[PDB]
Structure 1
């Protein structure tokens, strides 16, 4: 529904700090590592021991994406599978499932590029953010064999 506990969307790292997912030092550590590694603060922060669900959950709050409680519940369809292919889905990291409100529902494991494809499609589509473990398996759901 709705949540609010004096959170701050000032920065990705801060967003997690407000919730208390990572230690104050964890943020600085991941940040400093990004300057030497040049990787994503999120993926680099995970090294501290942060769960994927948390790293992705924050991305949805900062990127304003819609996170999926799960994948097993999702109901895939053939029509949606026509939008993107198995290999093509990996090209952008998105996978269709169905349509709602005259829009195309596509679950991708990359909210950062959500706008990249959203702008390329030039059409009304609902972009969700699901874990890499659930999003990967979803491929079998959206792309049923035979």
Structure 2
């Protein structure tokens, strides 16, 4: 014993189990597909009829980013777009929304590169986690076109 590893499955599982969001049986149903595909079990769970948002919500605590509810109730500032352009936004899956607490709130549905972006920016920025569904609609609100 005391010789563990824990893969991406464990990372989702432990988190869900911490709050008791899903049950062992639901995890096992998805685990069988992961054994044949090797893909991220999170999608497998969602494909069994589970909510997609619950995957993003877990990813938020596992990376230490606050999860975002939706984007319909947001007003992206013009000043926010001066640090993150629409070109850079799609390159890193990030969209700024405004200056808050002396930092700039940036919403990302793919924070996999959050730490890379933090270094590249080399300026005080804040990062949140949202679904790609809300992100696509917000990207157009922050970067509109006449």
For residue 74 of structure 1, report the CA deviation from its aligned partner: 1.7
Structure 2 unaligned residues grouped into runs of 5+:
none
Runs (4+) of structure 1 exceeding 6 A deviation are 1-10
- Summarize deviations over 1:107-141 as a string: whole Å, max 9, x none: 00023332232233222211011122111100121
Q: What residue is the counterpart of 1:58 in the other structure?
A: 58
Q: Which moves more between the two structures, 85-94 or 27-36?
A: 27-36
Q: 1:67 to 1:88 in 2, by over 3 A?
A: same
* Per-residue deviation, 1:54: 0.8
Say whether the 8 Å CA contact 2:76–2:141 is kept in structure 1: yes
* CA 78–5 in structure 1, closer or farther in 2 if over 3 Å, else same: farther
User: What's the CA shift for 1:6?
Assistant: 20
For the residues of structure 2 that align with 1:4 and 1:31, how far apart are their CA atoms? 18
Q: Residue 10 of structure 2 aligns to a residue in which SS? A: coil
Shift of 1:91: 1.7
Aligned partner of residue 74 in structure 2, secondary structure: coil
Partner Cα distance (2:65, 2:97) in 1: 17
Q: Does the CA contact (< 8 Å) of 1:9 and 1:62 recur in 2?
A: no
Distance 2:8 2:91 in 1: 33
Q: Distance between the aligned counterparts of 1:75 and 1:3, measured in 2?
A: 49
Deviation of 1:56 after TM superposition, in Å, equals 0.9
- Which piece of structure 1 moves more, 83-92 or 125-134? 83-92
Instruction: Give the root-mean-square deviation of aligned CA atoms.
Output: 6.0
> Any idea what the Cα deviations from partners look like across 1:32-70, whole Å, max 9, x if unmatched?
433432322322332222212111111112111111222
1:1-146 to structure 2, matched below 5 A, reads: 11-146=11-146
Q: Are the structure 2 counterparts of residues 31 and 10 from structure 1 closer, same or farther at C-alpha, using a change threshold of 3 Å?
A: closer
**Contact 1:8–1:18 (8 Å) recurs in 2:** no
**How far apart are residue 93 of structure 1 and its match?**
0.7
Moved more, 126-135 or 33-42: 33-42
Question: How many pairs are equivalent?
Answer: 146
